[PDB]
Amino acid sequence: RVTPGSLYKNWTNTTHTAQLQQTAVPLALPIFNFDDISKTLNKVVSYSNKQYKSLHHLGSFKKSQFNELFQKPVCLVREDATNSFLKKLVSHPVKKFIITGEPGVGKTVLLSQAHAYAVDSKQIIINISYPELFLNGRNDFSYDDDLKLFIQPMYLKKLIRKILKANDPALLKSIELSKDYKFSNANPKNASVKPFVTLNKTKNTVLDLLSVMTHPHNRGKLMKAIIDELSVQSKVPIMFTVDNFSKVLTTAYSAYRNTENKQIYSLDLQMGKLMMDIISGETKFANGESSTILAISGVDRTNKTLPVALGKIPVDPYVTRYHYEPKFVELLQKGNVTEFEVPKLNKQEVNELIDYYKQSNVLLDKDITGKKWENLIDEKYFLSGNGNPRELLKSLVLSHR
Amino acid sequence: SRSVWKGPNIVPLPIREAMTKGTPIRTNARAATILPQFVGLKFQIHNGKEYVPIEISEDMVGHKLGEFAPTRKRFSYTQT
Amino acid sequence: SLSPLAQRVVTQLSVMSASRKQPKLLKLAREDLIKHQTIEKCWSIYQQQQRERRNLQ
Amino acid sequence: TRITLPRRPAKKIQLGKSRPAIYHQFNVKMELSDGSVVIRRSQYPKGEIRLIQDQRNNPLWNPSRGSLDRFNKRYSSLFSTVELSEENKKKTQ
Amino acid sequence: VVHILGKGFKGKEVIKIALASKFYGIGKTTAEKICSKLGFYPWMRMHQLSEPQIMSIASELSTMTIEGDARAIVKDNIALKRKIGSYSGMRHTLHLPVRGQHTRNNAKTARKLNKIDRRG
RNA sequence: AUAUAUUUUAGUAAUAGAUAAAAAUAUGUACAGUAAAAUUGUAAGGAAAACAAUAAUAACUUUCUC
RNA sequence: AAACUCCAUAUAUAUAAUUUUAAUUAUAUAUAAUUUUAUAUUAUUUAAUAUAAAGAAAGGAAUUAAGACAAAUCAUAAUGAUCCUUAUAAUAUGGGUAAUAGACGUGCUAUAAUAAAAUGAUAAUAAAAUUAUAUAAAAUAUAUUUAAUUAUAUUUAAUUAAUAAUAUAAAACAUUUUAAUUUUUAAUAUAUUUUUUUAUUAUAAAUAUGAAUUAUAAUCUGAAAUUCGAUUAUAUGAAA
């Protein structure tokens, strides 16, 4: 008893997935570029078209945000938060960050900005938004024999596709291969004719490698090969990113069960192990400017692990595996992860946001009409808990109290 | 003693004399666990009112004696 | 038409019945028939002899 | 009221044509309680059977020659005769 | 659609849960163990199963003491109870509650299905 | 081992004996046989259900044998 | 009757070497209101409405008279009369008070998505009360390959208490999941909705509700758990 047009989903899903961004005012806002941050240092800025294209593919813009409020997802540049982070990324020798903060402070937004910057500066981006998919057991998996770990060839395929599409092909096909690669063919065409697909050293490309389509049991092998290729190449920078890395840290054991009924460890998987290797000084990328940018989510569980990894708490040895996994900490220490605290909004920034919202026509009538502007701003600041952006946004729009 | 450790529930009885010569054992215990040492001994277990004659088979070995002497009469209704 | 119990009874009945379970008749050639007769007669004689031996004893 | 199988018309066996009921029978080996095997013709399809309770292990047929099991299993550490002697005072009865 | 060991299954039915629902011998833990043995990802659906996987499941079910055999064990136990002049056996025979309950009022479920031939 | 085609089987049903005192075609003819009671027993079975058993072989023929 | 009374409230004073700390408290002693004042608007100096300025100022408990109902209690206890005195008095062992056709009250749990379940350790936020016929912390072991959870066992740290324990309150709020529901899944492509979209293929009246009833195994208390107790596990999964 359902039509195509009617809304059948729950609220959060509906807001994400039903395009109510359709009925919205076009806004001629400035464009996000790191080279011209001096112009737009503390102003709202729409992303470039190319950036948007890349960012959507990656999975930067998420469901629980209020990206439905505008024509397209929008951020502002911040001197204390985003700009400083970008500068650190540019300058630091290690280039290896974990974006920490309170729930709703704007970690994902920071990640999205970092991605956009990377896109601008001719870099490949391997984004893993929501590791919950590979960590929790809701897709097929298999123990590979060559690689001593469990591969996940539904998730992997999706990730490969994202990598292919998020990045431009000219940058991606500038990379020649280091080794030759045999794979099992899995086209609808040439199934009987071509039993195997072969990629040569100099002739073939990374783009071509990505476009390969194998059976599930070779997908993990393909992924491994791709990563190796990217590590080897020194022509283009590789930005690796993992958002909701908190889940990964806490969920040490996956929901998958091996032959004997017991839970599989995250490092015994392909994806989680690979990710950990990337984080640590192990799969070292040949080029400079090649970063790993991790991000915590307030959604996920909290425990002693991440604080212990960083310069926060001394290592209590007696706390349990559930609330403190030491292997993960050790791995984090190995690859010198310098954490980045996202600061809460200043008064001026809050004011600027409120002004933008007013321009876009999100503010309620009781806020605008018959009220001093400065007083309103102060109230908004108070209700957000002194500049938590999400909370502020909620107070503005989702209050109706 | 129900729990496997510390069991069974043992009671003093005239067992050896019954074993020698078929003299039924009039139990008023009802909470003594039956043992393998008395299968094929005649017991006369109390019912509240009247002692009930039973010959202990090998299927009874785990159970209590009072489980085989049903105290209440089988219920009926006088359809008036 | 019939219950499962009725069906099972019918099956049981069939087990006992000669309906469509029995082979063709054992036909013989005349020489074969003679051979059979000689086998049977000799056997019968032997059995009689044995009976007499036992009886005599 | 009376449960029946209602008869069809009977098939006329002609005089002389009546054939004896030779039922299908297998030669079946019965191994008794001890290793003594005996062949017997049987209608059920099983070439070999071995028997547990027979005349060859019954006391009536040779005078000259699992609740309990469960109990034994779960009161094994105690080892439960001496125990009988200990728990058998014949004063009270 | 997807038949396995005689029991029919609708598609999109999560395998372990479906197994627990249908087969008499198994609950939650047993179904999970079976899935682990066979190597299905948890929350895999019944429609996703290939034919060899189905056969392997069927084999696993056959190896386990389930369905009619499991039911029979329960029946045998109650028959044994009845055989000895036991209180529990007596209760089973008379269709009253067995587990030391009250029956001045509310003993309707027991009356309905405390038989010697229990399950159905 | 498996696929298709063409067949064959499975409609599962009682008498197997010239049946002989359970019940059923009550008039013809041909062939053959003998009932009942009482008694002694035997799972439920009991005075009363079913099944078993309960007069005599002299002479004769054939067969085997001392 | 009201009032004095108690609890709770506001204020003041006292005391507490601010390690028995919670001073944001506890407890003795006061004071405080059955609130006051003024402007108006209706009805006759007052009384209800409204407005204003002054205040922390707004509840609950106990107390339920006379009579009546020959209301309830001789099973809290006691006493009158009356009856029993080897029994209607006294002790032990077991059984019963838990029986089950129908019926009647009180409750509890349910019949799923403005509602159920997993999870949430720099442990979100309470109060009141108990612990020398005790309260039992941490930690080890088993159920259970990690560990947590829950349940037992092991063994008693601390305190007979503003000091330690019972005891990290729970809803809340947040992520995840949820059949009925082809209102979803997964194979392909697809892309500026990517924890997602579109296209084409295949996905065909009690559940992944409920927890009655029963089977087996363990554990707890006790000397003893059969009639007849309480947990945990693996199955069972009515009715609704």
Ligand SMILES: Nc1nc2c(ncn2[C@@H]2O[C@H](COP(=O)(O)OP(=O)(O)O)[C@@H](O)[C@H]2O)c(=O)[nH]1
């Ligand atoms: N920094 C920043 N954050 C914003 C802006 N606009 C909205 N946000 C909010 O940033 C939030 C993302 O915070 P995040 O740290 O991912 O929350 P978490 O997932 O709970 O950790 C969203 O909820 C947005 O509402 C902006 O212009 N800048």
Ligand SMILES: [Mg+2]
């Ligand atoms: Mg996040």
Ligand SMILES: [Mg+2]
């Ligand atoms: Mg089941």
Ligand SMILES: [Mg+2]
């Ligand atoms: Mg008063």
Ligand SMILES: [Mg+2]
């Ligand atoms: Mg203080």
Ligand SMILES: [Mg+2]
């Ligand atoms: Mg009065």
Ligand SMILES: [Mg+2]
């Ligand atoms: Mg009266």
Ligand SMILES: [Mg+2]
């Ligand atoms: Mg009175």
Ligand SMILES: [Mg+2]
């Ligand atoms: Mg009196």
Ligand SMILES: [Mg+2]
């Ligand atoms: Mg008295």
Ligand SMILES: [Mg+2]
């Ligand atoms: Mg007395």
Ligand SMILES: [Mg+2]
């Ligand atoms: Mg009562």
Ligand SMILES: [Mg+2]
């Ligand atoms: Mg009441």
Ligand SMILES: [Mg+2]
């Ligand atoms: Mg519910």
Ligand SMILES: [Mg+2]
């Ligand atoms: Mg403890």
Ligand SMILES: [Mg+2]
């Ligand atoms: Mg304390």
